Symmetry: D3
Subunit: 286 residues, 6 copies
C-alpha cells in the first residue's frame, strides 16, 4: 500500500546503476564454470542475480563520492541521490543479497562476504594514507575482493552441482583456478586505462629508480581526491617511456600458462573439455 512506496525509495539508488551496461566477464565465467558443473538453469540464475547485487552494491559503496558522470545523460549515483542515500541503499542491498544466498552453513556464508570488506579496507587504507601497495600486497588485495567474489560464485555453483560430478576431487583445482582467474581479470582491467592502481605503476615505483615527478603528482592527486586529466596523462607518459607495460605483459603471459594448466587438469579430472573457459582466458590479454 504505502509500503510499496517506501521500498521504492529504498531501492531507487540501486535501480539506477543496475541499468548500466555490466560488461559481464563474471557471468561469462559462471557460464563457463557451469559447462563443467551443469547446475540447473534456474539455480545459476539466482546465483548470478546474487553476485550481481553483491557487485552492484560494491560499486555504490565505492563510488558514493564520485562526481564524474557515467554515461551521456547519466550522472554518478552520488550526483542524483547524494552520498547518504547511496550508502544506505548499498548497505541494505548487501544484506538482502545475503538473505537471498541463504536459500542455496550460516557462518561460512557470512565469512565469505566479510572477506570482501577486509580487502576493501586495505585498499581504502592504502589510498587514504598514501601507501603504494607492493606487487605481493596488490595480489593479496585482489584475492580478497575480485578473486573473492569469483570464489563465492564458484562455491555456490559447486554446492548445487549435478550429482554425476565429483565435487571433492575438483574443489581443489577449481578454487586455485578461480583465484588465478580473478587476479588475471583484475590485472587486465587495471591495465585498461593506460581499480585505483595498475601492475605497471606498482612495479615502476618499487623496482628501481627515482622518478621524483611521479611521486609528487600522486601526492598532489591524493591531496585533491584524485588527479586531473593532465596529471593522468603525465603518469601514463612516464610509464610508457620506462617500458613498464612490458612487465605486465610478462606476468600475464605466465598467468595464462598457469591457468591453461589448471583448466586442462580439470578437463581431465572430468571427461569434459571446456573451450568456453579457455575462450574467456584468451580474451583477458595484454
Amino acid at each position: 500500500d504505502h509500503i510499496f512506496f517506501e521500498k521504492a525509495v529504498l531501492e531507487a539508488p540501486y535501480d539506477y546503476i543496475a541499468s548500466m551496461p555490466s560488461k559481464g566477464v563474471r557471468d561469462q565465467f559462471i557460464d563457463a564454470l557451469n559447462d563443467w558443473l551443469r547446475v540447473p538453469d534456474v539455480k545459476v540464475g539466482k546465483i548470478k542475480d546474487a553476485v550481481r547485487v553483491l557487485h552492484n552494491s560494491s560499486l555504490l559503496l565505492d563510488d558514493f563520492q564520485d562526481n564524474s558522470p557515467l554515461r551521456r545523460g547519466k550522472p554518478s549515483t552520488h550526483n542524483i541521490f547524494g552520498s547518504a542515500q547511496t550508502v544506505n541503499t548499498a548497505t541494505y542491498s548487501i544484506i538482502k543479497a545475503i538473505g537471498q544466498i541463504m536459500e542455496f552453513s550460516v557462518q561460512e556464508v557470512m565469512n565469505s562476504i566479510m572477506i570482501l570488506f577486509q580487502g576493501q579496507a586495505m585498499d581504502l587504507f592504502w589510498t587514504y594514507n598514501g601507501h603504494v601497495p607492493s606487487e605481493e600486497e596488490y595480489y593479496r588485495m585482489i584475492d580478497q575482493k575480485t578473486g573473492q567474489l569469483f570464489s563465492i560464485a564458484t562455491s555456490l555453483l559447486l554446492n548445487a552441482a549435478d550429482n554425476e560430478i565429483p565435487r571433492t576431487k575438483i574443489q581443489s583445482c577449481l578454487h586455485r583456478l578461480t583465484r588465478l582467474l580473478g587476479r588475471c581479470f583484475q590485472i587486465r582491467d587495471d591495465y585498461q586505462n593506460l581499480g585505483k592502481w595498475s601492475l605497471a605503476l606498482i612495479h615502476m615505483i618499487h623496482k628501481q629508480r627515482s622518478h621524483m615527478a611521479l611521486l609528487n603528482v600522486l601526492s598532489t592527486g591524493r591531496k585533491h581526491g584524485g588527479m586531473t586529466l593532465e596529471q593522468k596523462q603525465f603518469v601514463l607518459d612516464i610509464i610508457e617511456e620506462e617500458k613498464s607495460l612490458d612487465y605486465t605483459r610478462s606476468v600475464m603471459m605466465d598467468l595464462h600458462v598457469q591457468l591453461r594448466a589448471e583448466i586442462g587438469r580439470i578437463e581431465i579430472l572430468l571427461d569434459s573439455p571446456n573451450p568456453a573457459m579457455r575462450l574467456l582466458l584468451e580474451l583477458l590479454r595484454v
Copy 2:
C-alpha cells in the same frame, strides 16, 4: 600477525566511536526487561554487545560526513579516517553483528529485522534530501522502523532466551507493544532534548499551525547548506518557544506515559512480577 594487522585496519574506525560514552537507555531497557524474562547474564551480555555493534554501526553510517567534533580531543570519525573507510567499516560491522546474532539463536526472520532499520533510515534520508518535513504520523512510522525496531530486536532476542518458567506466548503481544511505544517515547524525548534531526514540536508547528515564512526559508537555507549554524538554530528555537509548540510535545509525552504505565501493569499481572526498573526508566524519559 599480518592478518591481525588487516583486522586492526578494518576495525579501527569502529574502535574509535566505540570508546565514546553511550547514552545508556538501551542497556537500561534490556536490564529492566530482563527483570521479567530472567535471561542468563552471559546471554544478555551477548545480546547487549550485538545491538551495540548494530547501534554504533548506525551512527557511523549517518555521521560519516559531518565535520563537528564529538568531544574536545575527539574529532568526528569522518575527520580521522575519511568517509570511505568509515562507511566500509560500518557496513562490515553490521554483517559481523548479524553473524553474532545467529551464533546464539530462523535466518530470514533475523535478516528482515535488520532490514527494517534501513527502510526506516531510507525514509529519513529521503525526506531530508528532498526538503520534506514529516507529518506526525510519518514521523512515528519512521521511529518505529528504526529506534523502535532496534529495541524490538533486543526484545525478540531476550524472549527467545527467556527462563523456561515465563509464558512467552501470553506475554509476546504486550511486550512488543510496550517496546514500540517506549522507543517512540525515548526518541521524542531525545529529539526534544536536542532542540533546546527533527522534533515533535517542529513537526507540529509546520502542519497544524499557520504560515511561518522565516522558519520555512531558513530551513531551506540550511537544507541546501548541509545544515544550519548556531544563530539559525537559535532562531528556529526562538520561534518554537514563542508559539508554545513545546507544550504540544508535553501533551503527547504525558499521554504516552499513561499508555505505557498501563502496559507495564498488564505485564506485571500476566507475570507475577512488579517491575520498578521499567517504571523508573519510563519516568526518567521526561519532557
Copy 3:
C-alpha cells in the same frame, strides 16, 4: 560635467545587456496590437522603450547571480560588474522607467508594475524552498509577470489609441487576448530548452507516477543553485520517454483555438482584420 561621469557609472551595467539580441516577440506583439489601435508612431516608440527598460531591468534582477556567459565574448553582467552594481542599476532603471511612463493615474501605474514583483516573489519563493508549482499556479505566476508586462503595454496603447476606435467595447476582449497570449508565449518559451520550469515537467510531477530519480536530481540541483549539463540531459530524457511533451502540445493547440477566437471577435468589433496578430500566434507553436 562630472555628473555625466556619475550617470555613466550608474547606467554602465544596463547598457551592457541592452546591446544583446532581444528576439523581440514583445515588439512584434505591440506592432500587431497597433494595427488595430493605430497609435502614433512617436508614442508606440516611447511605449516600446518603456517596456524594454522594464524587461531589461527584470533580466538584471533575475540574472544578477548568473555565472554562465551570454555570447561568445560576453560574460554575464554579474561577471563584469558584480552582483551589487547589477542590482543597484536594475532597481534604478525600473524607477526611471516608471518616470518615463508617467508622461503617457499614478496609483494605477504603480500597481501594474508592482504585480510583476508579486509574480517574481512566488517564482523565487517556490524555487528557494523546493516547491514545484501546479499547472494552475504556473499559470497564475505567468499572468503576474510575462502576461502582466504584456498587459502594461496593451493598457498604455489603449490609452493613446486613435480617436476613431471604441476603447470601451474593446478593452474587455483586448486584455483577455493579452493574458492568453503571454501565457502561450511563456509556455512556448519554457519549452525551448527541452524560465525555470516547463509545462511538461510540471505536469509529469503532478499527474501520475513515481520518478524517484527525477525528484532527487532536482533536489541536488536545488542544493547547488542549478543542475549541471548531464543532470539536465537526464531530466529531458525522462520527460521524452514519459511522452510528457505531448501534454504541452495538447494545451497549446487548445490555447491557439481560444486565441484565434479572441482575435476574430476583435476583428469584427472593429472593421479590421489583423493578419499580423494571427501571424504572431502561428509562430508560437509546439
Copy 4:
C-alpha cells in the same frame, strides 16, 4: 485568502529587518524639524513610515549578500531568504514607498528625489568594486547623494505639509542647507563609531599623508576577499590610532558643529522659534 498568502511571501524579507531596533536619528531629526513646521501628527507619521520603508529597503539592497548575523538569534536577511528574494522584496518595497509618497502629496520631482539615492549608491559600489578610495570631496558628494538626500526628502515632505503660518519660501534655502550639513555630520560620526564602509580618518590618511604600504596592501587583500576579518580590521585601526588621523575627524566635526549651530540660529530668528530639540540632536552627534 490566497493573495494574502502571496503578499506575505513578498513582504516576508521586509518584515524581517523591519523588526530590528533602529538607530533613531532620522525620526529624531524629523521631530526636531517639526518643532518648527508644526505638521499634523498624522502626516509626519506617514512621512516617517515612508522614509523608513525607503531606509529599510536600502539596507536590504546592500546587505543582500553579507553573511554576518545581525543579533544572536537574528541571522542576516540573506541567510534566511537568500539574495534573490531579498533583492526582489527590496525593489518592490521602494516602489511601494514611492506610491505612498504620492498618496499624500509633482510626479517627476518625487522620482528624481529617489533616483539621486541610487546615483549616490552607484558611486559607492563603483569605488568599492574597483578599489578606489574616495577623496574627501568625493566622500562628501556621495554622502549628500544618499544619507543627506534621504534626510532632504524628509525635509521636503515636511515643508510641503507645514502649518500655514510658517513662511516656507523664507525658510526653504536655510532648511536644505541645514539638512545636507546634518546628514554629513551624522554620516561622519557614524562611520567614526564603526571604525573604532569608509571613514573620514581613513580617507584623510591615504590622500594627504605619505605612503603606508601595509595599509594599502591589506585593503586590497580585503577588497578581493569581499571583506577583512577582525585582525585585519584591528590592524587598520592600530595604524590610524598611531598616526593620529582621528584628530582630523575631530577637527572637521568641530567646524561642522560651528556651521550647523549658526544655521539653526538663523532659522530660530527667521521663525520666532528656538529649537532646543534640533540643537540637542546636533550636540549628541559627537566624535
Copy 5:
C-alpha cells in the same frame, strides 16, 4: 651516496620546467652579440647556461601558483610539487646561478641580479593593488627585468670579449642597444596574446575615454586571481574596436628605427656588420 638523492629532490622542480621549449630569443641575441665580441664558445656556453637558470628560476617564482597546464600532459610545476617546493627550488637555483657567475666584482654582480627583483616587486605590487602602469612605468619595469636580464648577458660577454675589440668605445652603445632590444622584445611578446599587460591595454586605459565595462572586468579578474576565457575575449574585443593595436605598431616602428641606428653605429665602431642582430630585430615585429 645519500646526498645525490637529496640533490635530486632539491632540483626536481627545476629539471621539470627546464625541459620545456624555450623559444630562445635570448640565446639568439647572445649569438648575435658574440658576432661582434667573439667570446670563446666555451665561455658563451656558461653565460647562456647562467642566464637560462636565472630565467627559469624567474618563471618558477612567477608561476608557483599557476594552475593551468603547460603542454599536453605537462601540468604547471605547481601542480606537480606544490607551491612550497617550487618556491624553495627556485630560490636555491638563483643562488646557484650567482655562484656560477662568480667564475667569470662581487657587489656589482649581486646588484645586477637584485635589480630584477626590484622590477618584479613593482609588477607584483601593481597587480595586487589594482594599478594599471602608465606607459612610462611599464617601460621602467621592463628595463628592470627583461631588459636587465639582457643587460646581465651583455655585461658578462663584454667582460670576456676578444682582446682585439675596444670595450670602452663600445660599452656605451651596447647597453643602449640592449635596453631598447629588451623593451622591443617584451612589447612584442605582450602583444602575442591579443607578462600581465600590453602596450595597447595600458595606452587605452590612460589615453582618452570611459570604458566602464573594461575597468570592471579587470577588477573582477583581479578579485579572482585572473580572468576567465570569456572575459579575456571581451577585453580583446574592446581593444580591437578602439584601434588600440595601432598605437603599439606605431611605437614598435619607431623602436626599430632607434635600434637600426644603434646597430649601424656599432657596426661602424667596429669594422663588423651584424646581419644576425638586424635579423633578430626584424623578427620582433608587429
Copy 6:
C-alpha cells in the same frame, strides 16, 4: 625619491615580520660565543644583522601561505601582501644578506653555506608534501642542514673575525661540533614546546612503537587538508601523553646536555676562558 618608493615596495613585506618579537636564542648564542672570540662589537652587530635577515627571509619563504595571524593586530604576512609579494621580497632579502656577508669578509664557500639551508628545507618540504615521517636519523640530518647550519654560519663568521690572540685552528673543530649539537638541542626543545613541523616524540612513536591507526589516519587527513585543526592537534597530543613518548625526548635531551657540557669544558680549557654565558644558554634549553 621615486626609487626610494620602489625600495619601500620591495622591502615592505620584510619590514613587516622584522618588527615581530624574536625568539632571542640566536643572538644569545652569538654573545656567548663572543665571550671566547672577543670579536669587535661593530662586527658582531653586522654578523647578527646578517643572520637575522637570513632568518627572517626563511620565515617568509615557508610561511608565505599559512592563514593564521601572528598576533592580535598582526595577520600573517601572506594575509597582508599575498604569497607572490612575500616570496619575491624574501628571495631578494636572501641575496641582499649574502651581499652583506661578502662586504665584511672565499666566494664559493659563502654560497655553499647558504645553499645547505635550502637542501635541508628541500627535504623538509619533500617529506611533508609526500606524507613521509622522518626517521630520527633523517630528522637530525635535516636539523643540521638548517637550524644547525644557520648557527654554523654565525660561528664561521665569528671565527674569521676573532681577536688575534685566540688560536682559531686549535678551536675550530670543537667549535663546529658544539654549534651543530646546540642547534639540534635548540630545535628539539623548540619542537617540544610547540607540541604541548615535527617533534622528536612524534618521530619516535611512529618508528620504534607499534601500530597506532588513529594517529596515522589523522595525520593523512591533515596532510591532505594543509593542516590539522585544534581538536586533531589535541588528539595527537593526547596519544603522545598516554604512550609516554615525551619521556624519550627527555632522555635524548639529557644525554645531549651531557655531550654539550663536555664540549664547552674542552673549549674552556683550550682557551683559558670559562663561559658561564654558554652554559646558562645550554641549561635554559630544557625539556
